[PDB]
Design a protein around this ligand. Sequence first.
Ligand SMILES: Nc1nc2c(ncn2[C@@H]2O[C@H](COP(=O)(O)OP(=O)(O)OP(=O)(O)O)[C@@H](O)[C@H]2O)c(=O)[nH]1
Ligand SMILES: OC[C@H]1O[C@H](O[C@H]2[C@H](O)[C@@H](O)[C@@H](O)O[C@@H]2CO)[C@H](O)[C@@H](O)[C@@H]1O
Ligand code: PRO
Ligand code: PRO
Ligand SMILES: [Mg+2]
Lengths: 1032, 172, 264, 395
Amino acid sequence: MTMLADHAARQLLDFSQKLDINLLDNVVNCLYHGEGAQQRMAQEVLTHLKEHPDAWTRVDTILEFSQNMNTKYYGLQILENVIKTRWKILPRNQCEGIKKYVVGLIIKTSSDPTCVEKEKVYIGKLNMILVQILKQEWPKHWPTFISDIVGASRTSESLCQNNMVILKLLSEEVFDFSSGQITQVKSKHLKDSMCNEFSQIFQLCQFVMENSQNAPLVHATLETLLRFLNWIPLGYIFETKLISTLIYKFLNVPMFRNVSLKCLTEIAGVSVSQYEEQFVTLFTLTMMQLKQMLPLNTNIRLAYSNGKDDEQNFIQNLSLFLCTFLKEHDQLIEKRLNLRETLMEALHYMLLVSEVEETEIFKICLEYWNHLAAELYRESPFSTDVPPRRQLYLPMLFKVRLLMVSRMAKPEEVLVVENDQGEVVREFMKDTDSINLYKNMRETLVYLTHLDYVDTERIMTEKLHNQVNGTEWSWKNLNTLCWAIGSISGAMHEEDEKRFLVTVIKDLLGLCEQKRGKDNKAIIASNIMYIVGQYPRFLRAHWKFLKTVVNKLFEFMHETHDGVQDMACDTFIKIAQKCRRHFVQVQVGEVMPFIDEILNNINTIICDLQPQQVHTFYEAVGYMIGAQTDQTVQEHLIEKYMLLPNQVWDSIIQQATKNVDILKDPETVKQLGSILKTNVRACKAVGHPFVIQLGRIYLDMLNVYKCLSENISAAIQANGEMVTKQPLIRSMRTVKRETLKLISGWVSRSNDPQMVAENFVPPLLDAVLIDYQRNVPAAREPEVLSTMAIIVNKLGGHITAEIPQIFDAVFECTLNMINKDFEEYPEHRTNFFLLLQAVNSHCFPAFLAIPPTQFKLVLDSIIWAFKHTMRNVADTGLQILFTLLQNVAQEEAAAQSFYQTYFCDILQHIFSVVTDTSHTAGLTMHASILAYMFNLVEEGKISTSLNPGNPVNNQIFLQEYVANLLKSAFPHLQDAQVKLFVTGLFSLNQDIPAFKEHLRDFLVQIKEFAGEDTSDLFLEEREIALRQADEE
Amino acid sequence: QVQFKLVLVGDGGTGKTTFVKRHLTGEFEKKYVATLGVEVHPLVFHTNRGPIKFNVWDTAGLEKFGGLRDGYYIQAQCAIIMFDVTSRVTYKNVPNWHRDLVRVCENIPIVLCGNKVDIKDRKVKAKSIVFHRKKNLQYYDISAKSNYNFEKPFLWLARKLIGDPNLEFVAM
Amino acid sequence: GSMEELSQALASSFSVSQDLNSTAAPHPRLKSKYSSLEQSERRRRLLELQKSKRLDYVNHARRLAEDDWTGMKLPKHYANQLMLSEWLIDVPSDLGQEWIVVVCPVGKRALIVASRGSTSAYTKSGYCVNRFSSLLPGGNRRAKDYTILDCIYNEVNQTYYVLDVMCWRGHPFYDCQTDFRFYWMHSKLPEEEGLGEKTKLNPFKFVGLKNFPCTPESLCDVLSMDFPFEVDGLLFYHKQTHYSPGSTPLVGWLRPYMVSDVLG
Amino acid sequence: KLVIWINGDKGYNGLAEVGKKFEKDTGIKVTVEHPDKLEEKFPQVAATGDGPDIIFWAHDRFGGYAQSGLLAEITPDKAFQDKLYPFTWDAVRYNGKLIAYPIAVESLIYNKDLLPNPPKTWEEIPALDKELKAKFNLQEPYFTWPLIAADGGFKYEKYDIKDVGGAKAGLTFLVDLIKNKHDYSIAEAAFNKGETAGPWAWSNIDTSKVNYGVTVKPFVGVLSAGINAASPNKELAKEFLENYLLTDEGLEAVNKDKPLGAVALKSYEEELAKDPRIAATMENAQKGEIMPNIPQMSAFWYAVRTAVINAASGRQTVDEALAAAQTNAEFSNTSNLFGNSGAKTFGGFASSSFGEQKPTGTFSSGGPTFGGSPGFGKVFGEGTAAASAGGFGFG
Ligand SMILES: Nc1nc2c(ncn2[C@@H]2O[C@H](COP(=O)(O)OP(=O)(O)OP(=O)(O)O)[C@@H](O)[C@H]2O)c(=O)[nH]1
Ligand SMILES: OC[C@H]1O[C@H](O[C@H]2[C@H](O)[C@@H](O)[C@@H](O)O[C@@H]2CO)[C@H](O)[C@@H](O)[C@@H]1O
Ligand code: PRO
Ligand code: PRO
Ligand SMILES: [Mg+2]
């Protein structure tokens, strides 16, 4: 703890006698190699010490006498801190001292080739220190620096190498990472300085590249050139020998090929009209070099698979170069016949690279393939009189179709996930990298399919042939093929699609009969179903076939093989969603709609299915019932639909009426949970008309909820927290949650706020809300709050009147759980502020209708919300505050009183958040608020804040108030800084990104001690910008 | 002890600590109690070629609690940069973690993880994630909550360090 | 034409399990290549094979009870453990003297394994639907009392209606006949008291399913009499049939209304 | 202030007599309350803050409060455990931690004018009724257990809850005594004024002074003092209990108004060992049994109480109620009745904040934290490095 930490820190920082390097080395070595206690404390001590305002004073000694690299490095961290924050207030002779010690040490170390065996790591840290110094005083106090080092590079080769590293780092700090670390204007200034003095350095680099035989030096030079390519003027790139020098002297030699190719890729990324020929040159030469190191006769898939890290890196870098260049400049090479062979080679390369089994590389390639297919599609969207660009790519397009069909990713991603409770459910991932991959392959293949229907159907038919004759037969391969077949659904004309499908399912059925073994047959059947389910147009077109299919599904719902039941249900819910009407209406050759038949055979259909599969089934049928429009018929359908679960439900409710303690019976609670899950799924499908069922069980349901709640609560009271880990309480909480889910689920899809408000809302008040209030802290289900939010979001005006009593049950008691820290009871913080957001957004008059003393508590709850380190809570908090300000602006009666009451408190709390590093995520919101608020002060606030209203105008008062507040909060700030910031608040109150940047600037300024009269805040550029923004 | 040093970096509220803890205990932490400086947890996997130990340096991603920062990166053998697919900022901050990291560790295997892919409102789309490409980093969508692609980072790193691309994890 | 061909082919010959006259599909009176009218001889041949038992049942009950498998006309791993019937189509003429009938309640078929402290139920597919405490041997906490039962779970009555037994406290009954198993089961079941009652130690009531002879009078009787459950259908066992997991003609199946058109 | 909850039949007058000594030397007021059924109210009132600082009852209920986190863990210095006997400490022990201080061990009371001779068993007492008639408590399980555990009584092999009791032979025989005529204020009214043949009712035999005497299977209920964990007075309570109560004086001042019987304090128990009553009351513990301190006990107590009322004259029997009492042994109580929606919706219904006064009258009244305001000599170088530090560029 800070006991040992403080003690050791003080021992090291006493300053009354010689510093214990032995001890420091020991603490450091403990940190890098010690155990959790010893290491904890070492960590504590080192951080603690590093913080101290005078620790830097000892760094020189640390660098002078310490023998291990780690301690030196630590000392450098100590130094870096001072330079970063207190450099402008050190006694200047000390600054000079640090400058000399640092560049001197860098000379002595870098001018030793031992630097490698020496501490490369350590040297990087040194150079970084120098770059920090430069950042703090260049060129103002170091105007000859670039000349000095560029000149000193001609001295030694090692010195030059390290100098290249320094320049690179400086480039990174000035151009790449200046945002958030350097103020906007200072950043612009440094960028201008470097851009100005670049030609000198570029001459250095050109000299080194053209002449040096030193491999480390050359490499460092190239690595530096990479960043410079990130920012330098295009003349240096496209009007010098650079591109050539890279391709002829460096691209082919192994140890330089990667960096060289990366440089080339950066250059290739540039989109500029004037250097067409240079670009062509770039491509040609690059290609001619590539073919030497990666001949087109290479199995790039194997070459990657077996290959070492740099080989792999080179293949990836290659794919990047070709993809980049082709995407930005394909047109250039297209209109040059003399480049055909090269273009082809490039494409050929791509194809080879595509066969590589590595999803990242393949995504890189697929990016380009999708580009090409998209382009050719926009050129002309018609099949095989021929467009020019397409005619250029005709020799290889079918290879791309073949690639898409052959390597098609899985369409959906199913995942076995165990709930907050025990249950292992199947979770379908909705938006992931893999599904994105699939969607992109599908997109490309659809493009290419439109370009040629014949070629696509021919490819897939050949693949299927190859499945039948066993040449390419594998579960994986069959799956992939069918995934492709389904992926192009809708891309063909309906009659064509039918003609193609008939062939597909006929041959797949044949293959199913043909193969022997239940495994193979199961896989084939699964794929057949998948394809069928992906082609609903076909099913809708032909009723007899659809009926046949569905009957087959029902048949396979008994199949003992794993997967077949799952697939049967999954397919069934697809077909149900996409062909719902065909089950409600009477079809030709039928006396009754299919739904009646299904409902008449439900249990026989689902007797062998597991619970989750049954839910899927009920959901699927639920869609069919939703499809029936006649309210009466639909009501009867819903009634028969929910017969079986209602029987068990009724039995249990009866048992409970006779005796409540069966609600403590494990299997009973399980049954309840299952029944409720069925009701939820059903409700999702049917929608509003499900009310007839909901209303039927509603009050009973509420009762059981209550009971179980109470049960759970006591279980806490008796056995504390731990008791919430064993099966029973778990399954009970499950029942509560499914109850809430059912309620909010139906409310969300209810198209009558009146009825909901009068009927279904009042019982909740005592059944769930007052129960929530009644429960023990740990017993309270957070999912209550959230559900209420939903209801509010759905009702609004129809429930405003009820907002008070709701707040009686949940608000007060929930606060006390979440106002002692920011960590405990997270789901409650989340859901609570969700509810509060809902109320403020849809039922603001309720706030106008509640006592002031309580409104203070609400406002405080909001502030408290945006004070959170939890991202979503703070986010919602800021949103609420914004919409609340707007809401108040709407009601002109309360507006002035509200402003007069809370304006300054809000401002100061917000400012306390903005100046905090841990809240930067809400920057966009912060600005948006302050801007708005400050805008309001320009013309929309009639009353005056202080008694002397006349000497104290709104804007004036603000300016001096915010100024004094920030001055007292941050005493180390300068008057000019603060005044400039505060006028920046008014000047930019209609330019949000600018305001945001202004805030980032202030955030950087408050973290470093400028001190007295040191003015590198560039008031002219700043006040000019503020002026121009003020004009608009 | 055939063990490796893994450094885990990323913004605050990203999922680093929860991820490691779940890999340890098996539970899933609901609370956000920010890491201070660094917490190192030994974490073992059983491979077909014997056991392997990752000493995970769960570092703090809040600037306020940064601690020794890069100091923690010294002698690291591999790394996991992590961000939140529900917070675009955490992703835009990845190049910072990467620069600070690769300055101390010039040549180590690194995996970029998009965490919290279980949450529906995905802000950082898979389409937008490309930083690793030019940096030759390995990428994975993961979820410390629904356990999606839970062991892929450690598996890829293990393969890279050991040199056996066909290495696989086993029960015990 | 090609579409009629397709639909017809899909209905007729699209099968994974590939068993004849499967109850997974509706009655063949409405033709699959997996639809047959020649049950008779098949039954005889099947019974001929049972006679020379060349399979290891004891060990199998052991594997089921303690979940242990090893090595390479029998299944393993909790799936496909139940004896399933064909549709009753080719009625045997030695019916009334050699065929029993069981009236089957509406419910979900379940393999029941009581062992090591607990009882577990499985679908035909091997999915463990539930684990509960039961008075059945090996079903309570209170390591060698294992029991394997064939059941039909009725949700309404919350009752596992025991259709058949395959193991009771170590001793297997795959080796025995249907009639002897029915007697043995129907004797061991009522003589264990609370087993048929909702205790804390046993929440699910286990009840034996009454079986009857198939004399033209007895059939009118069983058709007439009431039952404590919604009748799903009728299962006509052969008296000597060993318990053989998977589909078989040695037990037939019929809907209640269909019986009126089967010699009575 | 320390607000004490204690039973009414005990010496709640003497505890105040000690509380005045505390009040004189401490300044803290000691209000010794006696509300409606403390053993039920104490665990419930802790839900909304209210409740006593320290509690007094037998150690059968403390087990329930202990796992909850209501009883403040006490760690008295080892010099204080020397004063009280080890087994009493074992009586209040729970999970290896002390939740309460052991105060006093809690016999046969009779009129010596009517029944001088002592029966060594219960079988030959009823027959002697017919003599006097011609010329104890009924509802609680506390008083009716002496014979229930005479023939055969949570068995200790630790108290396994799946092993509860025979209990029939002892209860039925007593019932037959109620049927042939061979509760609290009705029976005792006869004991006091000499109209019939624990130590919490010994001093009451004074104004009428019926000739008393203790003679020879009850409950050994160690009266204990538990500190509440929700109270701020955790340190001040143990001051009171160790230095003012468990002493020569304190326990004496409590014993003076109404005897405690056998007490845990060594120095004060050996003074009272000469006493016939206290020597014969610890004798009841020799053939008696030490009472469990677990959350599984309370259901048992209530069950024991119900089986006994209807056994005499009601709508239940003994074996019929023992078959149910057997099964009455996780959560003691939670919910009681299922149909309560209708009960609530037609009830009185109270009101709460956000539902009373006026909003558009005022907006402001008078009044990282919630509700708070926002929180926001020698130059460095010397040696080779500084020297070599002329600059990259030279002048
Ligand atoms: N939905 C979802 N939430 C997650 C997931 N992983 C973590 N979280 C939540 O996000 C928060 C992450 O907290 P930590 O893991 O401590 O954050 P950290 O990355 O260690 O942040 P620092 O300690 O500041 O470095 C926790 O509140 C988790 O509940 C996930 O996969 N899905
Ligand atoms: O170790 C199991 C093996 O089987 C599966 O793949 C094979 C299958 O074994 C073959 O019989 C044939 O059907 O080709 C399949 C191609 O998927 C598993 O998918 C595979 O991982 C595994 O090697
Ligand atoms: O997930 C799918 O769609 C494939 C179909 C056959 C088995 N798996
Ligand atoms: O699957 C079952 O258990 C019953 C048997 C006859 C048909 N359905
Ligand atoms: Mg952390």
